[PDB]
Amino acid sequence: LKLPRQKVELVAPPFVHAHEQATKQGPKIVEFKLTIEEKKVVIDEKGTTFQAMTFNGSMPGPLMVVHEGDYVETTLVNPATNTMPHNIDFHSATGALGGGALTLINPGEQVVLRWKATKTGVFVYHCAPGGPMIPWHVVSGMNGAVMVLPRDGLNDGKGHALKYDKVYYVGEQDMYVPRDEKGNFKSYDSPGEAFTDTEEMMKKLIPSHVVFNGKVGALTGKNALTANVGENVLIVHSQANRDSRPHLIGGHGDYVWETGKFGNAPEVGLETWFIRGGSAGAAMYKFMQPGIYAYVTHNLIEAADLGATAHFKVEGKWNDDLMTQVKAPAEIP
Amino acid sequence: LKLPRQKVELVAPPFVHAHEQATKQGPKIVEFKLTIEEKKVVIDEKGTTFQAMTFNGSMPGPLMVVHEGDYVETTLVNPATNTMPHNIDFHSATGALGGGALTLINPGEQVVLRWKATKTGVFVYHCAPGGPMIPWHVVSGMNGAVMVLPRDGLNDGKGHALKYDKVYYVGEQDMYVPRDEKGNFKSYDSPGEAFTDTEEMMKKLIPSHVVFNGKVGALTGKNALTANVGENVLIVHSQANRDSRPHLIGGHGDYVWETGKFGNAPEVGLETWFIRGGSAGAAMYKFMQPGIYAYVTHNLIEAADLGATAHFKVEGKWNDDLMTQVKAPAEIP
Amino acid sequence: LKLPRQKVELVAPPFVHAHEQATKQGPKIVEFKLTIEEKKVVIDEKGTTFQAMTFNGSMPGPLMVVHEGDYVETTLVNPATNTMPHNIDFHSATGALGGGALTLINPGEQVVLRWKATKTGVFVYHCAPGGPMIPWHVVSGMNGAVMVLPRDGLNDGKGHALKYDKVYYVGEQDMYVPRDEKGNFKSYDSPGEAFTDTEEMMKKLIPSHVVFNGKVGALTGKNALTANVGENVLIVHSQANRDSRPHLIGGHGDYVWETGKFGNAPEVGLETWFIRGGSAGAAMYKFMQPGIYAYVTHNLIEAADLGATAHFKVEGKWNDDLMTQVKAPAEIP
Numbered sequence A, B, C: 001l002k003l004p005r006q007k008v009e010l011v012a013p014p015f016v017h018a019h020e021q022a023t024k025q026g027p028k029i030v031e032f033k034l035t036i037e038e039k040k041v042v043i044d045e046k047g048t049t050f051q052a053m054t055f056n057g058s059m060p061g062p063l064m065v066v067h068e069g070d071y072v073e074t075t076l077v078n079p080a081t082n083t084m085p086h087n088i089d090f091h092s093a094t095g096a097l098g099g100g101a102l103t104l105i106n107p108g109e110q111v112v113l114r115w116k117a118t119k120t121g122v123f124v125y126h127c128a129p130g131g132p133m134i135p136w137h138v139v140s141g142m143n144g145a146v147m148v149l150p151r152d153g154l155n156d157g158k159g160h161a162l163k164y165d166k167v168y169y170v171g172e173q174d175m176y177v178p179r180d181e182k183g184n185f186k187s188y189d190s191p192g193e194a195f196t197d198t199e200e201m202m203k204k205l206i207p208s209h210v211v212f213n214g215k216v217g218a219l220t221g222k223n224a225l226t227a228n229v230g231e232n233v234l235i236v237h238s239q240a241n242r243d244s245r246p247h248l249i250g251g252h253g254d255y256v257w258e259t260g261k262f263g264n265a266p267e268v269g270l271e272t273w274f275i276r277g278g279s280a281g282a283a284m285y286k287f288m289q290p291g292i293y294a295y296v297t298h299n300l301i302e303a304a305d306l307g308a309t310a311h312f313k314v315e316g317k318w319n320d321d322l323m324t325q326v327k328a329p330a331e332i333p
């Protein structure tokens, strides 16, 4: 394959490596490296720990961005410091179980897979070693997403360009942390040691935690997402194992691809959209009002109580036409 | 804001206050009042009780209907006879967490919020005080919906008007009533007293009851929904916290906006549609056959066993072309 | 009704009786017979048993295929060897609870129902005797699907014919098998004897098993689905009670009707789609690569651990342009 090669420096979520939307480039081989890391992490503000398994150290794995007709060449590395075999499956790719059947690597090995980006949209990628290990590796954190843009950029299905000013990637993770008899979350010395209890819980289908970017509160405070009034923000949302229903509290989805695929026109003016487990979707919104927004899954129990809330802090001028407090709280006459 | 003012007399669900579909009116300030009521109610035919919190005394809160570009001015009242702070968040509105950040009122207070109806469709509204109180107030009943109609009324996305002969609002409520050791549902003296047990159950994500209009069997018997053969009925369905899959048993969704937003064309000829938790959707059907219909969520366990069944009683002439019993039950030859 | 009559020989899933896509035939009365069978079956590779209730002996019931405007005349037979009353409800039909209100038959009886196929798409049919029996009969296996094709065959919504080379019907079944105190699955002597424990479990909303074609591994091994590179395969997927999220691992949904209704254009290029509980949907894919594929629900816990995995074995030539292993696993430099 005699095409130009381009390296990408991946960046940790929720940020997204620099890329063009519309491009004059033709097909290239776009080179990415993912290095697997198994590690024990803290997942909530109480100090609960979790045996995570990750691409590039993060949950989710980083967003990869290419254009239709590019070839995506990934070097997947499984250092000898890990304990388990791993692989990678791209929902964007055609053949060999998405790549999984060509990428199984033991600790100490690496592999190089190339796939042609023939389908546009946002797509999940995840580890899938085989059998019961498939769900376990995924719900341990081994999932991310790839975006395959049209070469002319995004459009509204009516002939008009949609151009985003910035993009964020929100990866949602269902986590299954068992409890002891008295009701405290358990801690484990290794992923292998966590497996039996964790699988028992998994099969009951109810997560203990549902988080964005790997942790309760990850996308809040210093790490809130940001925008200004007038900016059009693309929010890519993935969930590799379990459904979600994103909602921007105080905003909308102006243009939404909930099934995540750019060969389809977006829907307009949504309140809440739906990410099928095993997929990525995307929503664009032009901010109109300053202040704090919450970005949630709109099962509010999961949002407020299990971890699945992000914030935006938005700068700009308040628009009293759109909303105003006519009378502040006062005693009832 | 120098626009005409129009008061609306809200009516309890499943009915909907009188309104125009297509209108020659221009933008107005449309005035609504919602008075919060915390109250213990009965939710099933066994006499199980429930610590409800409501807008205007009902579950769901009443449907508000306006047109695109109207300004919706709501007086939210929290009488001193209530125990908790409350607010209101409109998914139809832009800014301040949908209004929640401008409407927090203690018992004995009221507040007046105005928002411009810039997005068409059906939308959830709900209380959202902050933090863990958000899901608790919602699943205690503090949710309803608003419909923002195009000024030209509804259309099919192909240039033709859809006009409904009547509209009903079905609000679905997931309820979390704990049980005692021997397995009976518990009763509580106050919402505050119900909170700890109720939150514990909430986080396990499985409701004890899933009801329409606040109670098992609410929309049956004397209170069945009604229609005649030839009538086009709009059914607005909301679920502020948890997914649902509406289905009209013996009918269809002729025109369905499952994501609920009129800037999108409806889908046609559905059997079952999907209401994302945190949203409202809408379906229109022209009745063709008389008799009883059931309107359900098509998780039939929730429909038949947890409470989520309504009936329609339809008058008119049976159509043997559409369906006929060729041979009544008989012994097998 | 003076139309020609045509008998169909039904075939067991996942196969589909022979039919035309586009046809020059006009409306006919298409005759089907379904014979109910209650039977104890094995549902997993451990030998767990299950009190099934079936149409024609299979889970799912067989796929019925007709064209728009046909009249579907079904003889439903409930032999005296069964223990319970049964009926049939077609989501494709108009009136009488889909037919259920006209087809209730005791053991030893049969009934003949005709309905006009006025809505195109794939649709669930299921038993629905009344009250709590409704979910129980459905989740015991009493559900299948019917496909109502346009007379001109399928199209892409842009004026082009879609023609499938073969069709498979994947019926997904949520099953609720209780466990004893020590944690083993229970066995029962009759459906009636299984009812109390099974209903208790049902109302908690978590299945023990989620299977395709009635059993873990049913659509694997000798019974894997098959295709060749270049073949366009239609996959009809139904779920009468509970949501699913189909995904073809290593492939896509080239054209997908997730809500299942052919009056709507398909979506294109999906990774994962969504079958609402109480519905059928359909996806077409043209295979591009040989080898094994897994067809799953993409809650991977349900796929890998609860039973919901099928395989395709695909013959043909590997396409190194679409995907290639650039470097096989090797030691990290």
Ligand SMILES: OC[C@H]1O[C@](O)(CO)[C@@H](O)[C@@H]1O
Binding pocket: A155, A156, A157, A158, A159, A262, A263, A264, A265, A266
């Ligand atoms: O935005 C994508 C959509 O836009 C169009 O190109 C033009 O309407 C469609 O063919 C496609 O589905």
Ligand SMILES: OC[C@H]1O[C@](O)(CO)[C@@H](O)[C@@H]1O
Binding pocket: B155, B156, B157, B158, B159, B262, B263, B264, B265, B266
């Ligand atoms: O019904 C709403 C839909 O109808 C149209 O106005 C005409 O096709 C579209 O632009 C819109 O999405």
Ligand SMILES: OC[C@H]1O[C@](O)(CO)[C@@H](O)[C@@H]1O
Binding pocket: C155, C156, C157, C158, C159, C262, C263, C264, C265, C266
């Ligand atoms: O494929 C079905 C779709 O195709 C059309 O006939 C042509 O665009 C539409 O009217 C219909 O919704």
Ligand SMILES: [Cu+2]
Binding pocket: A053, A085, A086, A087, A127, A128, A129, A137, A142
């Ligand atoms: Cu792995």
Ligand SMILES: [Cu+2]
Binding pocket: A089, A091, A124, A126, A278, C247, C249, C298
């Ligand atoms: Cu996958």
Ligand SMILES: [Cu+2]
Binding pocket: B053, B085, B086, B087, B127, B128, B129, B137, B142
């Ligand atoms: Cu409240």
Ligand SMILES: [Cu+2]
Binding pocket: A247, A249, A298, B089, B091, B124, B126, B278
């Ligand atoms: Cu909300």
Ligand SMILES: [Cu+2]
Binding pocket: C053, C085, C086, C087, C127, C128, C129, C137, C142
């Ligand atoms: Cu039955």
Ligand SMILES: [Cu+2]
Binding pocket: B247, B249, B298, C089, C091, C124, C126, C278
């Ligand atoms: Cu049904």
